[PDB]
Amino acid sequence: TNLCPFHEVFNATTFASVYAWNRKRISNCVADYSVIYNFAPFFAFKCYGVSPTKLNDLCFTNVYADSFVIRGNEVSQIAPGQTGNIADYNYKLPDDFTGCVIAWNSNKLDSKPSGNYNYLYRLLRKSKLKPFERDISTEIYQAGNKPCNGVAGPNCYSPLQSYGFRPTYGVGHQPYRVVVLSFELLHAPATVCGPK
């Protein structure tokens, strides 16, 4: 029967930013996760509730794929119970997370010698973000007392900071594309069961 759209997220040209992480709904598909192993050796293929080699033998109720790019050294923040700029302000994973994390280097695609400024990570936020939330607001952050009237000033700046990815940057500041596969394990009416 129908195959899965995994080719739309792994064989894509560009990924979304961290503050605007795109969620891809997967349903009514036979997920052959072997198509992911043939990709470049991932810096991190870590499943927190199952083993990556057992996915093809299980059924999943609702599986969603999240995509975004980070500076590499932040991959340690994409995991349950982590803290930091990303984990707190852009993408938060719950402590009860049941899924797999996939991260690989993209210094060839998402980096330029002049600097690619199309990726942002929302440096600052007023409150810490909750699991599976998205704050695409680009309003000015009021750090001082004076109400910021929409113009950057000595006490209110813009929250979105841009990455300056360049091939000359060493490992740790390079772009690492992260794919988070979240699926429910309980035996509810399934929509993705794999190749039998």
Epitope: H7, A12, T13
Partner: antibody, heavy 121, light 109 residues
Framework: QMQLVQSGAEVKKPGESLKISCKGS????????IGWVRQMPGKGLEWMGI????????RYSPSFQGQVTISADKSISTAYLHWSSLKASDTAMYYC??????????????WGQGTLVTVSS | SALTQPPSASGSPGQSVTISCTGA?????????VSWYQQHPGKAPKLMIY???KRPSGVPDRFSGSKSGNTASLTISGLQADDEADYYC?????????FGGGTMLTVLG
């Protein structure tokens, strides 16, 4: 100044090897994707593949997987396109392109003069 | 997928014309991975439009682009004799560029 210069016109016969080149200067020939494009007489453009001169990572189009190979000599800043056992259908204009400082990584903002390849018995 | 374009288009000087492109695919990042190239007879193409809401420098503002669903449009405001060329659309979403059959732009008069 940035410019791409390609080998001259090549006239061959079927069953013969060919290796055209396209040399780039005025920019770093290690961080830009270089590729080749086919345009047959009166037909449109056909994309064959790209490569990363830094580390040789070749991305071929499904219609040109084993029919042609792409390589680069990072030391002399030149990209190549190698054929084996040419066919009468391979006669066409072959361009080289590279991504520009703007856009995505396969946008192909800069092009070459174009290399004319003709093969006839 | 493969893109489709009209075999030819026609327009008189001063008027405007539009070129349609159907078949543009998409990925997770977004939808508009659309670009347009101009090729005069006897020389290599040139990037006219990329990221249809954008265009490179050195290109007159007469060239505009848009997208409504899987249909992309190339709008030329003022026509001139030096506009006759083959215009191709390119979809580069799934790490694969697909060029359309192209359309011949011939100016009347």
């Amino acid at each position: 100044q940035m410019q791409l210069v390609q080998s001259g016109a090549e006239v061959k016969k079927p069953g013969e090897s060919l290796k055209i080149s396209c040399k780039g200067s005025g920019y770093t020939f290690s961080y830009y994707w270089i590729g080749w494009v086919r345009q047959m007489p009166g037909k449109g453009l056909e994309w064959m593949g790209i490569i990363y001169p830094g580390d040789s990572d070749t991305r071929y189009s499904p219609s040109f997987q084993g029919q042609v190979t792409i390589s680069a000599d990072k030391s002399i800043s030149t990209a190549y396109l190698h054929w084996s056992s040419l066919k009468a259908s391979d006669t066409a204009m072959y361009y080289c392109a590279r991504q520009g400082d703007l856009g995505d990584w396969i946008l192909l903002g800069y092009w070459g003069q174009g290399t004319l390849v003709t093969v006839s018995s | 997928s493969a893109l489709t374009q009209p075999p030819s288009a026609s327009g008189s000087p001063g008027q405007s014309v539009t070129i349609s492109c159907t078949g543009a695919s998409s990925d997770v990042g977004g939808y508009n991975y659309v670009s347009w190239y101009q090729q005069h007879p006897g020389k290599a193409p040139k990037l006219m439009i990329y990221e249809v809401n954008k265009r490179p420098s050195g290109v007159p503002d007469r060239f505009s682009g848009s997208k409504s669903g899987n249909t992309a449009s190339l709008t030329i405001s003022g026509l001139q004799a030096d506009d006759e060329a083959d215009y191709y659309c390119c979809s580069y979403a799934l790490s694969r560029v697909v060029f359309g059959g192209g359309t011949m732009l011939t100016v009347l008069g």
